[PDB]
Amino acid sequence: TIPHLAIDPFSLDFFDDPYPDQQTLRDAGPVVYLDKWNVYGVARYAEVHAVLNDPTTFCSSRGVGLSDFKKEKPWRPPSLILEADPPAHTRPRAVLSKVLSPATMKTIRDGFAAAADAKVDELLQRGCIDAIADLAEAYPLSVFPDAMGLKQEGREHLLPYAGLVLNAFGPPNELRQTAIERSAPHQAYVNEQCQRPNLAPGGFGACIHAFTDTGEITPDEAPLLVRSLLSAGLDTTVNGIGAAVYCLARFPGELQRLRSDPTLARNAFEEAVRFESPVQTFFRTTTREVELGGAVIGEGEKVLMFLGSANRDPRRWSDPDLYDITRKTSGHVGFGSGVHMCVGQLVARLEGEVMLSALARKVAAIDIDGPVKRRFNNTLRGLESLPVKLTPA
Ligand code: HEM
Ligand SMILES: CC(=O)[C@@](C)(O)c1ccc(C(=O)O)cc1
Ligand SMILES: [Cl-]
């Protein structure tokens, strides 16, 4: 009943160009079986959305990587929010949404925007830059660690740790196992900064620790919640902003529209998240035999969702393969959906918005002027290097 496919969605060939294999996965059926890793797969919008919005049947407390925490020891203590189910998930989730709240954005927006404008001015002085290292990486590095309240020393561990975490959701391929080796220094840095004395006052970190008073989290839970933000708060935003710049470089008509109305900046970023979906995939585990679409999945089975595929499903999107900064993106799953929906989405959107606004107002053209280097990661899609010529407006 369920088609079996030999596609390895964690192979370098797949990462290099996933779109054809994603149409094959969508068109094979609403539920496929991936013989390479003995997991179920869902690549259409409808089933991806369904799985994300049934956390009782498709749980996260058995890990959202390939590994089943019921069967193997997690490579690090489980995240209290990503790798938890309701009700244990609920109060830690509420703390993080209050920490990363609409009201919190008001306190950081002006500083994030001035830093975005200053970076674009700096890049315009150099002209030929790497839109990854000099922009997509540099800008979030210039605002997020400080907003966390992190000290200056050791920030070089942050991006390596984030890439490890994302690779670790993957199967035990050499990307993952090489990341887990080589990981000890990054883990020790990150874990130490999660301790209250190391988090500057007013920052996101100290704000998490300040919620240990309410009955929502206990003091021994606060370091792991800080770890969550240091795990998830940087690399995807870098690659989301990298995606947007890449899109504007490949679709000059869209840059011209953005320049003509910079208030499109926020939706231009949202569309880049749909179009390139920095978080490509992750898993749920069935707590129960379930009929998904029209297929039966046993208990205790890993289910791989293809978020980027669902965001390009022609069953849900008109011209899914076009970057359209005026598209109604509402409903894309680039930030997930349901109870785990990205709790840091307001920070990502703010960072992406103020950067695209700075470019919208200051840049006339973005031309690729060197070899584009892709990043290969078991769950992240993004760029290693994106040489561009920025022409000032
Ligand atoms: C473009 C940038 C980002 C993308 C594409 C993204 C993507 C996602 C996705 C798809 C999920 C759902 C995971 C699941 O359902 O299992 C998620 C959850 C999460 N994200 Fe984001 N994220 C981004 C930025 C951020 C930022 C800036 C932060 C923190 C400042 C953050 C922190 C988190 C956390 C803690 C979770 C777990 C939420 C939960 O389990 O309730 N992310 N992210
Ligand atoms: C899988 C995902 O969506 C991502 C990358 O944003 C994420 C990574 C780690 C955590 C955590 O709690 O440590 C939360 C989210
Ligand atoms: Cl860790």
Please, what's the b/e burial string for 342-374 (b: 16 or more CB within 10 A of its CB; e: otherwise)?
A: bbbbbbbbbbbbbbbbbbbebbebbeeeeebee
Cα 49 to Cα 330: distance, rounded to the nearest angstrom: 13
Contact present, 241 and 355 (Cβ < 8 Å)? yes
H helix count then E strand count, the chain: 16, 13
Name the binding residues for heme b: 89, 93, 284, 340, 342
Tell which atom from ligand 2 comes closest to the C-alpha of 282.
1
Taking each helix axis from N to C end, the angle separating 90-99 and 222-232, rounded to the nearest 10 degrees, works out to 60
Closest listed ligand to the CA of 112 = 1
**The tokens 């920030």 sit on which residue?**
155
Cα 175 to Cα 199: distance, rounded to the nearest angstrom: 32
- Write out the two tokens for 357: 């606004």
Query: Which residue's alpha carbon is nearest to atom 13 within ligand 2?
Result: 228
Cα 164 to Cα 271: distance, rounded to the nearest angstrom: 26
Q: What is the DSSP letter of 198?
A: G
Taking each helix axis from N to C end, the angle separating 235-250 and 138-148, rounded to the nearest 10 degrees, works out to 150
Cα 48 to Cα 39: distance, rounded to the nearest angstrom: 15
Residue 250, amino acid: R
297 contact partners, CB below 8 Å, separation of at least 6: 31, 40, 286, 289, 290, 291, 303
Contact present, 58 and 31 (Cβ < 8 Å)? no
Residue 349, amino acid: R
Cα 19 to Cα 174: distance, rounded to the nearest angstrom: 23
Q: Is 281 helix (H, G, I), strand (E, B) or coil?
A: strand
Q: What is the DSSP letter of 136?
A: I
- Write out the two tokens for 17: 């160009």
- Write out the two tokens for 8: 């390895």
68 contact partners, CB below 8 Å, separation of at least 6: 62, 285, 300, 302
**CA–CA distance from 65 to each of 78, 96, 193, 357 (Å)?**
11, 22, 25, 35
Contact present, 72 and 168 (Cβ < 8 Å)? no
Sheet containing 387-392: give its strands across. Answer: 128-130, 387-392, 363-368
Q: Residue 279 forms beta bridges with which residues? A: 380
Query: Which residue's alpha carbon is nearest to atom 11 within ligand 2?
Result: 228
Name the binding residues: 89, 93, 284, 340, 342
Closest listed ligand to the CA of 161 = 3
Please, what's the b/e burial string for 253-270 (b: 16 or more CB within 10 A of its CB; e: otherwise)?
A: ebbebbbeebebbbbbbb
211 CA to centre of ligand 1 in angstroms: 20
Residue 362, amino acid: K
184 CA to centre of ligand 3 in angstroms: 9
Contact present, 40 and 303 (Cβ < 8 Å)? yes
Q: Count of alpha carbons within 13 Å of 101, Cβ hemisphere only?
A: 10
Please, what's the b/e burial string for 141-174 (b: 16 or more CB within 10 A of its CB; e: otherwise)?
A: bebbbbbbbbeeebbebbbbbbbbbbbbbbbebe
Q: Which residues line ligand 1 (CB under 6 A)?
A: 60, 64, 81-82, 93, 96, 100, 228-229, 232-233, 236-237, 240, 273, 278-279, 282, 307, 334-336, 340, 342-344, 347-348
Give the residue from 25, 9, 22, 30 showing the smallest Cα distance to 296. Answer: 30
All structural domains of the chain with their residue ranges: 1-393
Q: Which residues line ligand 2 (CB under 6 A)?
A: 64, 79, 81-82, 165-166, 228, 231-232, 236, 279, 282
82 CA to centre of ligand 2 in angstroms: 6
Contact present, 8 and 39 (Cβ < 8 Å)? no
Contact present, 261 and 218 (Cβ < 8 Å)? no
- Write out the two tokens for 171: 């199967």
325 contact partners, CB below 8 Å, separation of at least 6: 254, 257, 258, 264, 267, 268, 271
CA 386 to chain centre: 19
Residues with CB under 5 A from ligand 3 (ion): 76, 187
Q: Which of 89, 165, 280, 339, when mutated, tests ligand 2's pocket best, judged by the most ligand atoms within 8 Å of its CB?
A: 165
Q: Quick count: other Cβ atoms within 10 Å of Cβ 111?
A: 13
Sheet containing 58-59: give its strands across. Answer: 4-5, 32-34, 39-42, 302-306, 281-286, 58-59
Cα 202 to Cα 204: distance, rounded to the nearest angstrom: 7
Give the residue from 331, 187, 188, 321 showing the smallest Cα distance to 250. Answer: 321
Helices (H), the chain: 12-16, 19-28, 45-52, 90-99, 102-126, 138-148, 158-168, 174-180, 184-193, 204-210, 222-232, 235-250, 252-260, 265-276, 307-310, 345-362
Tell which atom from ligand 1 comes closest to the C-alpha of 52.
15
Contact present, 383 and 242 (Cβ < 8 Å)? yes
- What are the contacts of 8-17 at 24+ separation with CB within 8 A? 8/34, 8/36, 8/37, 9/34, 9/41, 9/281, 9/304, 9/306, 10/37, 10/170, 10/171, 10/173, 10/175, 10/378, 11/173, 12/376, 15/374, 15/376, 15/377, 15/381, 16/374, 16/376
Residue 271, Cβ density class (10 Å: 0-12 exposed, 13-18 middle, ≥19 buried):
buried
Give the residue from 171, 163, 166 showing the smallest Cα distance to 68. Answer: 171
233 CA to centre of ligand 1 in angstroms: 7
Q: What are phi and psi of 120, to 5 degrees?
A: -65, -40
Q: What is the DSSP letter of 230?
A: H
Tell which atom from ligand 1 comes closest to the C-alpha of 64.
16
Contact present, 96 and 208 (Cβ < 8 Å)? yes
Structural resolution in Å: 2.0
Tell which atom from ligand 1 comes closest to the C-alpha of 204.
30
Contact present, 151 and 200 (Cβ < 8 Å)? yes
Cα 173 to Cα 3: distance, rounded to the nearest angstrom: 24
Cα 90 to Cα 180: distance, rounded to the nearest angstrom: 30
- Write out the two tokens for 388: 């561009």
Residue 260, amino acid: S
Contact present, 249 and 367 (Cβ < 8 Å)? yes
